[PDB]
Write a protein that binds this ligand. Structure first.
Ligand SMILES: *[C@@H]1O[C@H](CO)[C@@H](O[C@@H]2O[C@H](CO)[C@@H](O)[C@H](O)[C@H]2NC(C)=O)[C@H](O)[C@H]1NC(C)=O
Lengths: 90, 235, 40, 180, 180, 180, 40, 235, 236
């Protein structure tokens, strides 16, 4: 009449995982390890501004293109950001 | 290392509730119970409640049994304290602290990691353990600070000790069984004898002179328990 | 964009720079931690 | 699963158990209710946590990435550059995908022992003081109150203490007394 | 294997069971014969199947190989091109070669479980209404006819129907009665 | 861990068992003493020895890097060369680590069943004739001397030879005599 | 330096020549052969 | 994605014997049971037999006990039918058919994938389930097709449905538990009631008129049985 | 192939000590028990004792019991033999044998590989356990039968393994305890045991076959490896 069971936990959980033998196994508890999101902006790398050359090419900047004036002498940079097909090359 | 990070200093009107939150760097965050512990201007520590992120069962201290609601979110890496029915006795700095235990339901609830604190002000304490408030020993001498308690709390669990310099939030100096964490310098013997436990400091220096709190789980009071405090004064 | 994370992996774009998560080409990547949730 | 506890003789989980991943339900004259075996739910978590932290620690020395640029008449060394990165990202994807899939299978079959072996501890303590009922569950020959349940639960039951209580019962549900 | 069912206490498999991987054999006053646990061979097949399909589907993110051309004075970037392509075919050969090797170990031990976990299922159903003969094979106190067998086989045996019948036999092997 | 034994119900190993990995300890009228099970240690060594040589064999085709010299204005394929070799040396260093980490888990669990499967072997022979004492150890009913220990040790004990002897003891420490 | 070894791996230098173990960027690589140890 | 490809359309004299072969697309060939299921011109379906490719052991229908001999080569992933002594009755189109279960010996032996067809002719009928021969309901109405049997088949094992357009081989509308394959639209729901299984087609459309066959295991014959057929007509 | 390489040809005087060594190529050496067997000029084999590298436990023969201490150094794949109070009749060649058995303590312990041989000469200041006949002579291309008899504390129970030894080389292993032949050995050499006597029959006798052959096993009563007398087979 008096008695004691052993058992395991169960819950309102929807999230499922895979294995070599079982696909979509529902479990009580998961943990993603995959980043999927970004902010769509160019940012600093640790308080150090990049160099967004805008519509110059590197060559446009170094040779001294009269369109590339606002770059005539630049501060230190984290990284450089050339465009796809920069309008102001040679 | 892990870092907790808390919300901006809120000011509030008696009656009107508050919600304050903290968020965790570490990915394995559903494995560690998170607690909320306030410190009203001056005095000493007090544990409101705590949560297991993994399971989301909380438990509270009775003083707040129905007033506060604390919960954690799994997806973002964050926990919340919802202090309803605010009033004047409530003004404090509120720390969120992580216990290495996955649940906060017993001795294993020590506090190895603390947030930087959220001051909550309302606009217009009884310690459960017993420490003298002022031990004062000389440079290069040894101090032994004592927490004393009883079978419900200290006498079954034992205790974790904490250090608190003015300004900074508290750092853990011993786990509940007298092991020291990584950082802690190798001259802080924790110990325990029956219903009283003693953090023994050897070779004092200016650094050491702060406040010291013991803590444990009271099995009768169904909650976390702190001593009053002990200001160490080196001289 | 700038990536934010603690996660070991990401799938935004292969050519990163800085101290980043590690590019993989997957859409979904979840570890199990709990029990089989077949209740009752 | 492999060990045959979860989704085995212990048919389905209890929703009523919230405090932890594994535990005991009981019933006696006073009591009835759930109670999680935290200490071993705790040991299990220490594992699964270390597992996540092991994988992050293997994935900081992947093959790194920084950038390079090619002339129009160097097109085929451009290619070689591309086959390369696209070789390496084919390979770390497989390693990620497969590691997770494998360590997922092991993690699930880990929980399946945690539960079997808990059942076996209760068993070995209680011997013929209790009747193994077979659906995950024991019923006692001697009545065993809330203070005795903890003792089973915290793993310090005391066989000799209830022996003659129990074996009076065994002795009579054997109807061996029915002979007088 | 790890679970000790195959090549263990069950002392070899039966040739005569042609229709499935695991199962029962029995003898009663009625008859004698073999019967495959189709049910649980099917849960086996379905898992060993997902396994071979799991592999295949992972192996088409394999490094795609196309060829390039180099003259007589680009010799050393021709080498780089080869040290790469060999290099990879080693990384993927090692990977196929070991993944087969590791899922071979697992499969055979998976079977070794399925059996143990079948033995134990029956054992919990019949309890002390049979003897653990301890060679894989049980033997009943109460007589168990062909309908009874199906019950144990399909897993809907019921103890209480045969207890009295059984604990007359249990009662009397123990020569308690032998005090007349 | 997984299987229940090592660091389980058999709390702690013995320092006195020097000759082998698993084994027996007995206690009787004639002596007390330890005795390693060689048979099944020798089988475990076979399997570990094979594991060690398994790896060795699997990494003889592993990526060998002979160097290339590079120019001043070839800087960006010099790099491509450096990215590649650093690449492969990361991929194989990962592999070699992860394989060990994985094989070590498997190996420690291999012992874990080894022990348990030994115990269950002893258990299936000695049935009703002995008490499962619940800490790795059995006490017999019938009193069993050295020559008879061997049989259990070398798995050829004989139940139906000590039956009466033993079940005269079961018959009495069941308090069944006490009604006359 | 030359290496005289039967271990399957080393960590001296990537640009070996001869019949070698196979370079790995690791500094410790130890299999278990025995059981988990203890005092009783 | 699987593809069962049967063989050319051999045509023969009486007494003679045929060896048709279905050859499976897929790598896990052994794990799925293959059945052979002739359809004489104009009439419905009849199971000859079927095999577990992995185990070898085959199952025949009482009717073909001595005559047919079916087996399958694992190496080449192809299945074979040696039919013997064939007179003119034996003329039909001969389908091989994939079961989702591993062996063909019970209610789970339903036919989810079919080959293309193998017309055998011979130079010079009896259903096991009850199916109305015709059902005629108007365009965009809803339909209810019925198959009845008894305790040795639909009673215990339950039933599985099949659609067949003129010319094409049939395809599976439902499994024995009436869960629908991916393929099939959601207005084809099937269920069952004791010994009388029923598929309800809602929102009738031009598409839908063809044949429908129910099928089950009958445990009194050790055999797969089919209903007579039933031509649905949209109107 | 695994290599076993032995110490140089040491030359000592009465009463002193020796420490001969022996070093295994195989990285996996921890798991194969190593023995030290000797033979003095123009005689046969004598088992001093052996060690398991894995566990440290050695077994010795009564003969040398308190006066020989063999130990393995896991760390460097090296097994050490040294005997004390060494006198004259210890002038021998000290071979060094591996067994596929992890310990040397029963019929399992049969010697698959041998070291080159360490000669020891004491520069001043044997009785076998198994029965082989000393000479057997058989014509070219015939069939030879070589026998090894023992009692029951050895051959009867443990089985018995055979060895070949060419004048000057160490001995190759011809059969395992359990009749099975190892890799190099031609199907010409068939081992067999019937009861208390063990016989190795060799078909198609060729000039190479001519050497001395030893059988061996474990004796239950002596707790020791035991070789037979050796039997020199000639052919022309
Ligand atoms: C496993 O569950 C997933 C859950 O997403 C199923 O994914 C389906 O994927 C297709 C895309 O090809 C979607 O159109 C469906 O909506 C998804 N289904 C559902 C219900 O979410 C997937 O099919 C499931 N089965 C397997 C074996 O992968």
């Amino acid at each position: 009449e008096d008695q004691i069971c052993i058992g395991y936990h169960a819950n309102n959980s929807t999230e499922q995982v895979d294995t070599i033998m079982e696909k979509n196994v529902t479990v009580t508890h998961a943990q993603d390890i995959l980043e999927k999101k970004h902010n769509g902006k160019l940012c600093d790398l640790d308080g150090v501004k990049p160099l967004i050359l805008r519509d110059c090419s590197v060559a446009g900047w170094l040779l001294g293109n009269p369109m590339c004036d606002e770059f005539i002498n630049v501060p230190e940079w984290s990284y450089i950001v050339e465009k796809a097909n920069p309008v102001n090359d040679l | 290392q892990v870092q907790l990070v808390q919300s901006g200093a809120e000011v509030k009107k008696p009656g009107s509730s508050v919600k304050v939150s903290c968020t965790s760097s570490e990915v394995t965050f559903s494995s560690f119970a998170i607690s909320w512990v306030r410190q009203a201007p001056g005095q000493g520590l007090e544990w409101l409640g705590g949560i297991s992120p993994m399971f989301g069962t909380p438990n509270y201290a009775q003083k707040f049994q129905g007033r506060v609601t604390i919960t954690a979110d799994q997806s973002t890496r964050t926990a919340y304290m919802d202090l309803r029915s605010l009033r004047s006795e409530d003004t404090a700095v509120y720390y969120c602290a992580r216990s290495p235990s996955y649940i906060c339901s017993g001795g294993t609830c020590v506090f190895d990691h603390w947030g930087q604190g959220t001051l909550v002000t309302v606009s217009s304490i009884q310690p459960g353990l017993t420490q003298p408030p002022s031990v004062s020993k000389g440079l290069r001498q040894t101090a032994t600070l004592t927490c004393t308690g009883n079978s419900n709390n200290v006498g079954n669990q034992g205790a974790a000790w904490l250090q608190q310099h003015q300004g900074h939030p508290p750092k853990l100096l011993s786990y509940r069984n007298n092991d020291r964490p990584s950082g802690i310098s190798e001259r802080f013997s924790a110990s325990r004898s029956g219903n009283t436990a003693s953090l023994t400091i050897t070779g004092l220096q200016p650094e050491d002179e702060a406040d010291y709190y013991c803590s444990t789980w009271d099995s009768s009071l169904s909650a976390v328990v702190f001593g009053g405090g002990t200001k160490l004064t080196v001289l | 964009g700038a990536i934010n994370s603690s996660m070991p992996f990401h799938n935004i774009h292969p050519l990163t720079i800085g101290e980043c998560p590690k590019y993989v080409k997957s859409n979904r990547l979840v570890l199990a931690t709990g029990l089989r949730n077949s209740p009752q | 699963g492999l060990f045959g506890a979860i989704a085995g003789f212990i048919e389905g989980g209890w929703q009523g158990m919230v405090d932890g991943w594994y535990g005991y339900h009981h019933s006696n004259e006073q009591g009835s209710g759930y109670a999680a075996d935290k200490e071993s739910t705790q040991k299990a978590i220490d594992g699964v946590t270390n597992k996540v932290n092991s994988i992050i620690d293997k994935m900081n020395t992947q093959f790194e990435a920084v950038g390079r640029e090619f002339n129009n008449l160097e097109r085929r060394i451009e290619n070689l550059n591309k086959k390369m990165e696209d070789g390496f990202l084919d390979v770390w994807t497989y390693n990620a995908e497969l590691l997770v899939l494998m360590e997922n299978e092991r993690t699930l079959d880990f929980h399946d022992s945690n539960v079997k072996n808990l059942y076996d501890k209760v068993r070995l303590q209680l011997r013929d003081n209790a009747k193994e009922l077979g659906n995950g569950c024991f019923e006692f020959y001697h009545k065993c109150d809330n203070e005795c349940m903890e003792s089973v639960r915290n793993g310090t039951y005391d066989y000799p203490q209830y022996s003659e209580e129990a074996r009076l019962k065994r002795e009579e549900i054997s109807g061996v007394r029915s002979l007088v």
